[PDB]
Copies of this chain bind each other. A is one copy, B any other.
Amino acid sequence: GSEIFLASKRAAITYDTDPATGEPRAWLAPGGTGNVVAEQAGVLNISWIASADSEDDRRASALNPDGVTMELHSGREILVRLIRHDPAVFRNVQNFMTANLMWAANNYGWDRWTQPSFGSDAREGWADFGRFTRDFADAILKSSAQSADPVYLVHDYQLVGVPALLREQRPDAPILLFVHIPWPSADYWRILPKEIRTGILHGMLPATTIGFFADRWCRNFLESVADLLPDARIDREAMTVEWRGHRTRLRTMPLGYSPLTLDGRNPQLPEGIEEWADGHRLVVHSGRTDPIKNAERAVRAFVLAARGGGLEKTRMLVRMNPNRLYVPANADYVHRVETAVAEANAELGSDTVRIDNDNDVNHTIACFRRADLLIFNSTVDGQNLSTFEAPLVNERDADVILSETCGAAEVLGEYCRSVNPFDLVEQAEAISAALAAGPRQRAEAAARRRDAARPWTLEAWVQAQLDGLAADHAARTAT
């Protein structure tokens, strides 16, 4: 029975009061990473360490400084420990991780010719990231102090520094790090200031295992190590690094969907959509308000298809989920999509293209169900879960257009229409071909697409992390 210590940027807890008693209740959201790890066979117990990020989290951390045991179905439980960071330090780290800085680095946002220009803001942000990393590492070790053989699972890019700090005090422990975003080519990674570009690698490499959603991101990480650490040796075949007596294994562990979040339900469309869409084939683009989601280019590609004819009774819905609209890149992305939709309507006719904004999961699934064509054309994406979710719930045999730069394309690309997300002509040709295809062709393609998507569950991805780490840990011990 492994004693598991999970760390992530957030443990999503719902705070409320009981409908009968009025008593405050605090309960873990179902489908959390910690929830799933707790159900696996070889797990004796589990703790979840994460940041306090709301006035309710701060209060729960201050009242239970060593963490709260929370119940789960089937009599299981998880000890949840939340960290109160220094508010200015935390706020500064949150800024550092947005498109203002590190989000642009891993997600390919800089032109090099005009951006970026690192100033003193970059140095202070890196200093705040070191303080934040120590906070986590202190908390994690403190939580596992009584444990003879703790197993460390570290999640999210914000925690890339933690493994070195863990390994410092726990030399023989299994430590997995999972990174949910892309890793950029070596020439791109090195845009970053020298202390950051080497400093993040030094934080990551002491892990037993480092996981990414795709092989490309593993390859790019390895190239960055070779380029920046003259001391290190990589092996592109075995997906390993040897550096300063640390051996590290790189693994690809794809993730598709949570069977819970779709489950069994039939939900309604957002207000006005069903009526607006009636009598028309519907192309749907869906994603958060982040420039990588690429809706601007999807609408321009739609207009180019339409100029070729055949789209007279076809409409397009751009579903956008508002997120971090305070980041100038994000507000600029909404502004640019708005401009394209306006220009599209003025050319092809009023109400051909509509934006619909919310963060309601139910509305998103209903839009995946209504769709006659689905477009997931991100400029880059660590994986993109929507590309597994939508075809799994759509019963219209909708084809899918998938960008070759999403981590999902490594698994689904052969079953979708794969495109270069920067090429409007190729994307327009793909939309027209998909709308011209027969009902039988689409039906047979959708069945194959679903069979390819179905195995990649949340529970399977967790099992892969534990299995992979156990094997890597045995290898690291024997070498």
Contact = CB atoms under 8 A, between A and B. Distances in A.
A199 to B, nearest CB: 13
Interface string A202-234: 000000000000001000100000000000000
A330 to B, nearest CB: 11
A97 interface: no
B123 A425 contact: yes
Contacts of A119: 304, 424-425
A41 to B, nearest CB: 39
A114 B300 CA distance: 13
A287 to B, nearest CB: 13
A331 to B, nearest CB: 13
A329 B425 CA distance: 24
Nearest to A404: B190
A118 interface: yes
Interface stretch (A103-111, A134-142, A354-362): A103-111
A265 interface: no
A248 interface: no
A334 interface: no
A187 B189 CA distance: 12
A187 B333 CA distance: 22
Interface residues of A, number: 44
Interface in A84-139: 108-120, 122-123
A291 B112 CA distance: 9
A380 interface: yes
A243 interface: no
Given A185-B185, A185-B186, A187-B185, A425 B193 contact: yes
A456 interface: no
A304 B120 CA distance: 10
Given A187-B220, A194-B423, A292 B113 contact: yes
A157 interface: no
A452 interface: no
A304 B190 CA distance: 22
A194 B112 contact: no
A113 B188 contact: no
A336 interface: yes
A449 interface: no
A436 B346 CA distance: 62
Contact of A425 (B116, B120, B304): B120
A407 interface: no
Contacts of A190: 404, 420
Given A188-B185, A425-B118, A420 B193 contact: yes
A134 B113 CA distance: 33
Contact of A193 (B109, B336, B423): B423
A379 interface: yes
A146 to B, nearest CB: 44
A425 B122 contact: yes
A234 to B, nearest CB: 11
Given A186-B185, A187-B185, A114 B423 contact: no
Given A109-B113, A117-B300, A185-B185, 9 more contacts: A110-B111, A112-B379, A112-B380, A117-B422, A118-B422, A120-B425, A187-B188, A193-B425, A194-B426
Interface of A: 108-120, 122-123, 184-188, 190-191, 193-194, 216, 220, 291-292, 297, 300, 304, 329, 333, 336, 379-380, 404-405, 420, 422-426
28 contacts: A108-B112, A108-B187, A109-B111, A109-B113, A111-B115, A112-B380, A112-B422, A113-B291, A113-B292, A113-B329, A113-B379, A114-B291, A114-B336, A118-B423, A118-B426, A120-B425, A122-B423, A123-B425, A184-B187, A187-B188, A187-B216, A187-B220, A187-B405, A191-B420, A193-B420, A193-B422, A194-B423, A194-B426
- Nearest first, the 8 closest Cβ-Cβ pairs linking A and B are A185-B185, A111-B111, A113-B291, A118-B423, A108-B112, A193-B423, A185-B187, A112-B379
